[PDB]
Amino acid sequence: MEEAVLTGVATDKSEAKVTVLGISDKPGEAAKVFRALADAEINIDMVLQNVSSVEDGTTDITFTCPRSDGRRAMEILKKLQVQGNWTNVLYDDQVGKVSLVGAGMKSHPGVTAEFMEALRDVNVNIELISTSEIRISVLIREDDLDAAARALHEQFQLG
């Protein structure tokens, strides 16, 4: 069977991304980040952490939250920077998010490939990626939203 459906394209620019850089890859370290945000009653959406490097056993943790809570989140975390031996906490309140929404996309790697190819062809740089069987999300410059959305609509024939 290997059946899939592509249902649409979503854009958003209501969020900031904060990145904790150089957090040590051992049990309990992510907890410190998210408990701190939690105690400040900050509600977050995206969390991305890729694998830690062999060279120094650290990684980065990025999360998204409403733009109005960004600075406050990034300020709650700074009181953990030295304890956790982090390199820095980056901040960015100009990030846009474009997704392709669907279902069953694992069995069609062409979709993911074509997603990336569409954005290449309209000269949009993909900064972050988070995908699943039902959503291919990337974070980009908010100014590239329109072009990205449009490039995706054409490529996959949604709209």
Ligand X SMILES: N[C@@H](CCCC[NH3+])C(=O)O
Ligand Y SMILES: C[C@@H](O)[C@H](N)C(=O)O
Residues within window 4-43 making contact with ligand X, judged by CB under 6 A: 43
| Spatial distance between the Cα atoms of 103 and 16, rounded to a whole number of angstroms | 27
Determine contact, residues 7/158, Cβ cutoff 8 Å.
yes
Examine residue 83 and tell whether it contacts other proteins (CB under 8 A). no
Examine residue 47 and tell whether it contacts ligand X (CB under 6 A). yes
| Spatial distance between the Cα atoms of 137 and 9, rounded to a whole number of angstroms | 10
| One residue of 1, 79, 82, 83 binding other proteins per CB under 8 A | 1
| Spatial distance between the Cα atoms of 20 and 49, rounded to a whole number of angstroms | 10
Amino acid at 50: N
CB of 27 to ligand Y, least distance (A): 5
Determine contact, residues 76/112, Cβ cutoff 8 Å.
no
Amino acid at 107: S
CB of 49 to other proteins, least distance (A): 4
| Interacting partner of 48 out of ligand Y, ligand X, other proteins, none (Cβ under 5 to 8 A depending on kind) | other proteins
Q: At what angle do helices 29-39 and 70-78 cross, to 10 degrees?
A: 130
Residues binding ligand Y (CB under 6 A)? 23, 25-31, 49, 59, 116, 125-126
| Spatial distance between the Cα atoms of 47 and 19, rounded to a whole number of angstroms | 10
CB of 16 to ligand Y, least distance (A): 20
Examine residue 66 and tell whether it contacts other proteins (CB under 8 A). no
**Site residues (CB under 8 A) for other proteins, limited to 7-46:** 7-8, 17, 19, 25-28, 30-31, 34-35, 37-38, 41-46
Category of 93 on φ-ψ map: left (φ > 0), alpha (ψ -120 to 50) or beta:
alpha
With CB under 8 A as the rule, give the number of residues binding other proteins.
71
CB of 58 to other proteins, least distance (A): 12
Site residues (vs ligand X, CB under 6 A): 1, 43-45, 47
